[PDB]
Design a protein around this nucleic acid. Structure first.
Lengths: 61, 99, 44
RNA sequence: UGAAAUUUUAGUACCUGUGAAGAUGCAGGUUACCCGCGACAGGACGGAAAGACCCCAUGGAGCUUUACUGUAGUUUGAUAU
RNA sequence: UAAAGUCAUAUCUACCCGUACCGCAAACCGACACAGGUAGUCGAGGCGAGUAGCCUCAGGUGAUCGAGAGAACUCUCGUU
RNA sequence: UCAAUGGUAGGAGAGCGUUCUUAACCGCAAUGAAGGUAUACCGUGAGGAGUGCUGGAGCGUUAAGAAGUGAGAAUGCCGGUAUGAGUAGCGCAAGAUAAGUGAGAAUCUUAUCCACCGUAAGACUAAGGUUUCCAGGGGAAGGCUCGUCCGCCCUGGGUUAGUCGGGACCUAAGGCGAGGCCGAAAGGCGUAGUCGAUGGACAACUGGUUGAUAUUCCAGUACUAGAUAUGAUCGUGAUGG
RNA sequence: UAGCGGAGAAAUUCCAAACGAACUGGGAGAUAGCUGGUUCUCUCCGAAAUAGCUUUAGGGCUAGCGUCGAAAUGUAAGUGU
RNA sequence: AGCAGUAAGUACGCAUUGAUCCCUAGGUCUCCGAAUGGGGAAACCCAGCUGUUACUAGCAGUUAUUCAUGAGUGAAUACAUAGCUCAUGUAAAGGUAACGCAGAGAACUGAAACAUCUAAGUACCUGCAGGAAGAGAAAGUAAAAACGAUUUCGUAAGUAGCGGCGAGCGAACGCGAAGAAGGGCAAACCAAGAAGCUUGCUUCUUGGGGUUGUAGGACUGCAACGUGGACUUAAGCAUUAUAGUCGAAUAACCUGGGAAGGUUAAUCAAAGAGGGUAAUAAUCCCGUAGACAAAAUAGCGCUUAUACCUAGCAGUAUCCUGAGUAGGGCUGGACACGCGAAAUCCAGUUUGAAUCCGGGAGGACCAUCUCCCAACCCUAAAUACUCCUUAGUGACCGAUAGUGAACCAGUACCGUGAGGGAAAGGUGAAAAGAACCCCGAGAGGGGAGUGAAAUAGCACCUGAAACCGUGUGCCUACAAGAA
């Protein structure tokens, strides 16, 4: 689970050929990273969308 | 009522018109033992406090409807009360007003 | 022959004591069903 | 001292027929004082068992498979890391 | 480390729960004063290897409707 | 007058009875409402009143409306009563007499014999039972029968520890588990730690004692640990080893 | 160690007087072309048990077969001889 | 004006001086339990600290955790950091009637079977909340002038649609009614500080600026409107719950055990609602209609300055206006929408703008036109449901009903457990409950007496029905019946 990436592994539902009414489990991107040090020094998970928008504003946010 | 009391009429019921002194009403009973009135008698065993028994002229209580308080000239009715003085003044209607 | 329950005191508790039933967030729920009904007792 | 199962109620015989096609109770005919009591089992298609055999249900379960659909799982490749 | 120690010495104290009874059982668990089950420890003599028998120790018990009559029959026993 | 009137599933029409209906209409009722009961009336039917009696408070009318609304019958249900049937059984073992007890004794109590078990059918002790123990009294039910007896019932007492078993010690198997781990969530895992005896640690044992408690009450002997009172002396010596 | 499960010297064996899928509560008065049950009084009229189709044959959908009402009476059709 | 809950049942007593009682507030509040000093099976054990007061005591309090906030500490390793310690803040854990929201989410069914659908995103489960919640201020709908946030209801209307186009599911628009409130911020800028003080800093902190659609603000102009809205503060006013108070209006006769019934008369009137009373009451009582009453009590509402932030306005130097954002690919889902011509929105994943000459919508989409300005936040009101508090209402129901439960019901009882789950009210007006006497071991009876009544005698009104009877007139012991 990653906090500032928003949501979690959130449930969904699977389709098929002439769909058979099934289920999926949505998983986001899971990366434990520790990028910046503002007073941070804090390891935490992240998602790759938030990785590519680390240079959006994510050094303190 | 308020605490009876005095001689008290009995209009309806088994003994019409009978008047008799009261003090002992206990209004939670909602029917009043009055001397002379509703003459119960008990065939009691020859036991403690009466080693013969067989006769107890204790008398039955009769309902508030058949209690009728008179003011002191023997005049009953409806108790207008609290009306006159410091805490409370009892009286009946068409009455000589005394308590 | 042999029957089911020949319990001892540890046996009569340790499934149904107030902390046992209270423990797992679940048995206390069905105890609260037993309270919202409110039968002769609670814990046994 | 004292129950159970039990059942339309029935003072409920026999033969020969008849009949949802095998009679106690029906037709014809026969024998039978009334009521019991101790033992017995041929019936009363005796009970107890909405057949566990067979069959049916667009009935369900379980099992099997190279039925059809899938699922996880297993193994590619893409692609952010 | 100075009586913390420390022994003599002296007299007090020493908490809380459980403690009765039954328990191979009419209280247990077998709906029952039920013909089951139920730890463990001891468990006499006499013969007798023997904790098997068998009769009496110590000990405990008469276990719960009976009398008749000895049918047939039914079942446990003894014969041929 | 003529013609019609077997009739199931079928369909149409009509009417009865119950209850509530604020309705009104309009009475009854203690001289007896309702309801019950007998009844030798009437009505095509369903149904209706009359009288006798119980009985002592609500009920009836009419007309109309509204309906949980018209009872046999389903393993219908619930409650009661049969039936079989005075039959089965009376729950694995033998008592016996005399005397008491009482009102009433087989079955209660005693005496005296018999009998049985006796590696038990003894005693003592787990779990269990949760007062069943004992004393006195009683016999509504219970006792598989009786019953003065009782594990039945009323009342009252009865269980005593520094050393007995546990806890104030430790810990397995295990459980819970702050930290942490992962996980829609709840959660599930788990380091430290924490409890967890059936285990390992440790002082008391003889005699007497009741209706009943005894290693517990007390005679005798202890020992364990601490205390305060008291000549030490540097001593204690840890979670480490 | 708990049911989509467990255990299992394995039979489909057991999982609290008891299991090829445990027990308790809810869904949910699951469902049921199949069984049973159906309650007051009268009058009048009065059946079918067949065709056609149907995963249909012990069931439905029409049509034939009743009943009542209405519109006229194809200007008589009907039904006989 | 007696008290001495239940109710007998006793006793010391207690009390118009004012009790008992009613209400309001305060008090203490055993233990467990969120349960929390530590352990622990619920009614436990063992503590530590601080004073107490005495003891190998006792008392009183402090000592669970997480979070937040400080303070100190300070390892590898110098600072630091982790980590540790202390202090402060119920915060906050927890119990929860029903409604909500959000996540997670089936099956059975039905489709005459069934794989698509349905059931329904419902059953369940978890979390988050309040008195309601969400809900919301157009990056909207619509299509011509057409309006102007939402919400609920009716309508449109099963209309448009979708769908093994089966079986089904299913709108919106517009209109009608209720209810009818929008307001901030970041941004841009301006000022202050501190700082990359690497100077001119181009990041942070404070306060103005202003929240925008026909653009709006900043820059140049320039106006003080009460405001839950530009302060839903405090002070008075008023009144309600929260104790209750007063409160009218009648006599006789007949009957009976008893009148309110029948009969004779009279009254009242904001009270002839209803309930008791031995038997049906307006005038007997409670009451009732009205009319008064509360200090404390929880409020509601009105007036007051204050409890504070807003306006118009012309012009447009340039900036701003909500970036991984819209979008695009794929996989989903919701939207009536089942991938379809598929809109439009929201997810994962990937790619990625423009930014006022802008951008978006107008059911693929390309131009013209209409409307709007997202990608920042809050918003009462009309609505949903009651465990609850009364005020109550009944063509509700009368003890198999009515709550499982009118009764010591969730009781007994079953089951180890989760669970299940019963049966039962009525004497008499009043116990006035049968003194005594006799039978009887006792109970029970029988007399007496009791009461209107004793078939009325303690599970007692009324008492069928099956069952058992006892008496009774007739008939049957040569008979083989749906009786």
């Amino acid at each position: 689970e990653c906090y500032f990436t928003g949501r979690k592994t959130v449930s969904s539902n699977n389709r098929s050929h002439a769909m058979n009414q099934t289920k999926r489990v949505v998983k986001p991107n899971l990366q434990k990273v520790t990028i910046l040090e503002n007073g941070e020094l804090k390891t935490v998970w992240a998602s790759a969308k938030a990785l590519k928008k680390l240079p959006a504003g994510v050094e303190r946010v | 009522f308020v605490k009876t009391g005095d001689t008290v009429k009995v209009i309806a019921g088994k003994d019409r018109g009978t008047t008799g002194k009261v003090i002992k009403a206990l209004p939670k009973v909602n029917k009043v033992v009055v001397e002379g009135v509703a003459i119960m008698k008990k065939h009691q065993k020859p036991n403690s406090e009466n080693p013969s028994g067989a006769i107890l002229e204790i008398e039955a209580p009769i309902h508030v409807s058949n209690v009728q308080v008179l003011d002191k000239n023997g005049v009953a009715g409806r108790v207008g009360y609290k009306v006159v003085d410091d805490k409370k003044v009892r009286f009946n209607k068409k009455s000589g007003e005394i308590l | 022959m042999k029957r089911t329950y020949q319990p001892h005191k540890k046996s009569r508790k340790t499934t149904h004591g107030f902390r046992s039933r209270m423990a797992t967030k679940n048995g206390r729920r069905v105890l609260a069903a037993r309270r919202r009904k409110g039968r002769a007792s609670l814990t046994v």
